[PDB]
Amino acid sequence: NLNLPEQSTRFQTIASIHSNNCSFEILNNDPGYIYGDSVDGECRIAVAHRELGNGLERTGDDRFLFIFYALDNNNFIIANRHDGFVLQFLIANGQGVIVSREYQPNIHQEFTIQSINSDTFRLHSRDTNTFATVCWAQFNSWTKIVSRVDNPGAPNANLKHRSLLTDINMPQLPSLTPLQPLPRLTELEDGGLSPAQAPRAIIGRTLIPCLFVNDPVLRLENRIKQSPYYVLEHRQYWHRIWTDIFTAGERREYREVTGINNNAQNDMNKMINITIGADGPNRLRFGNLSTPFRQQIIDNSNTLGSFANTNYGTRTDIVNVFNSEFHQVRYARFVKAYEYRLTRADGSQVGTPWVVLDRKEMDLRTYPHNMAITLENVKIDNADNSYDLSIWKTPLKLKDGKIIIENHENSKPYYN
Amino acid sequence: NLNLPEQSTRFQTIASIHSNNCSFEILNNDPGYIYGDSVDGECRIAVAHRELGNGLERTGDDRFLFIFYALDNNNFIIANRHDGFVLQFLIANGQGVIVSREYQPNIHQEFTIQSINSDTFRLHSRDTNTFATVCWAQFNSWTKIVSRVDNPGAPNANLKHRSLLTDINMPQLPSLTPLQPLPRLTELEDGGLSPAQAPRAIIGRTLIPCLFVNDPVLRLENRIKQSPYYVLEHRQYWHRIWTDIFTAGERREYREVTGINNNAQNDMNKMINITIGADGPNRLRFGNLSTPFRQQIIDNSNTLGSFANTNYGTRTDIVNVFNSEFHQVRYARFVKAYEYRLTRADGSQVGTPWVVLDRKEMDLRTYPHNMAITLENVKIDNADNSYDLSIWKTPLKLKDGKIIIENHENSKPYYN
């Protein structure tokens, strides 16, 4: 069940309803370029780089094919299939024109659709109150696309789609699956599921427009053709941090490294202009490129907005554990992992997934069953930041199969 | 499965971290009101109606309890449990103050949470770059709440929640259910399921903040206590428009009224500041009150944004049907209905649901089974607008159990 307008899930041509054969066409022209068919005046001479033409439509020519990326504010970014540049309103020489530019974004790249009736619409420019149409109503002539205010005698701004491309390599979204409880251990030699073997739950997934995905292999002109959307998956799994056999009354010390490394955060930011905020493993910080889509990304990925000024980092805790059972016992200790994975439309992975180990949510598996180890002491060895310096209140019994989540009753600041 | 920040699903008090016992308090004061404890100057005298006080916190006093309604843009509207008024930044006498006002909304009612660490935050008015705190840092004194720019001398603006109310009458959201196919008819006297008996599918459901729900029985001061959110359900069902027994070769004429009446749209607009656009039965138009939440409402209700400048209206079609079967046959004719229902947190219905009859999606049930009636002629008798003036291409066989959806092959403009 995809909650998108039909303009966002296909490519379409854009034409005046008053043109027999002509549609909006991406040009790579310079100022001074002459539109041969045009009557003399402002419509004959190009005044900007990459104006749009009113060109004879060729079936399956990418210069005429546009996709409408839906923003949270009900406006659209309109990208072409030839080079992935977007439409932009621009004033040059006091003439309002439509050009194509790289996604910035800016308010002049945002367009409203106004439907007049079932098959007729207008393209409205945000904040200028102008509508896209053909220069001086030359609907069957080679000339530029302008954006002008409604006046009596202004060129009719009623548009239609002339042709569609529906075979566009839309991704197939994976099904949501719940996080399964870890299996019980079967003997003393059973270390439990390693991180590579642990099943992933798919908690959420969202489409990401290709415009701001810095795919290291596919340039924009190829992304718009083969992967106009990418898929961001929000996955969870139980991440084993250690396992050992303890004799009766055995004590041990472990270094527990949790969170997410600064290099992984920088990679995520470069790739999709999103990082994980320090306020939680499911809390997203958006940059200028991703911000206009933030509520769709949150709603579909089942994440939350971050309120933090700082990125989630790493923390090293030194834990002292004591086997107070009068038995030889296999203990396996797990924290909850949040795994963010980016795929192309063809399902290929773009890089290494971004993983946050959440120290605040933990589970244990034992053999024999229903055993308990005691967390006697926790010390912060180091942290990348001072956002969260809470530790477990000790002593704390960790029992086979019991999930423990940090709250104000079971934790305290490190110096207390 | 509720995708909201914890601040949005509870009430909380707001206090300076530097105050022993004091928290932000809703006042109904006027200019000239004296704050007795305050040092003389701008902090002693109220300069606006409904300033906020730095008051001694009383457990379960609604004047100290605030809920944070999450906007699509990651800002919050902050409402109090006493009277449902919201916080607003205001300049009076060149002093930046926090007041309480009725939800408008305006940009001065929008606040950002800036988290410094796990339990500390600041309240930012983004367009002014001011932060809420206690007048002249009088953190343990009766005085007003101000909003000031960061300067060396400026009162520390670090805040915390002192107390929580988590028992707030959050609604229980119904499960999603699919649209079931209509049962087969069992005999000639079986007219099929009437609209009152037809099972509803729940296609989507969303929380609506009580602030702009004009509940005809609950005033704002009671809504914020008993139903801080309302539930909007998007339901679908098969709506019977007529049923009759036809003899062999019998002809009949029906007036089919479809769409939604102007009075139902006005009621929906008054109640929740939303209407159904003419571009489809699942296409929502938002007014000034609902707009800041539009993407959340769309994503959760599984509707789409409308691009139309006009509301969905009614259309009356005159249909001529012919039983070309050599049998006495019971025919029952259905169109797909979209039903929008509003409930309080306790599950009670707020008024009559808003129904769109979609003439573009239709089904038939017959007895005996696998019979077909012929749609011989369709005429538009009248329509509220000219948005959709398509009719069925005739003759068109309607067969038992076969759903027909309008497309460019099976329909045409009324004059052709």
UniProtKB/TrEMBL annotation, chains A, B:
It comes from the Bacteria. Disulfide bonds join 43-135. This is Cry49Aa protein. The lineage of its organism: Bacteria, Bacillati, Bacillota, Bacilli, Bacillales. The gene is Cry49Aa1.
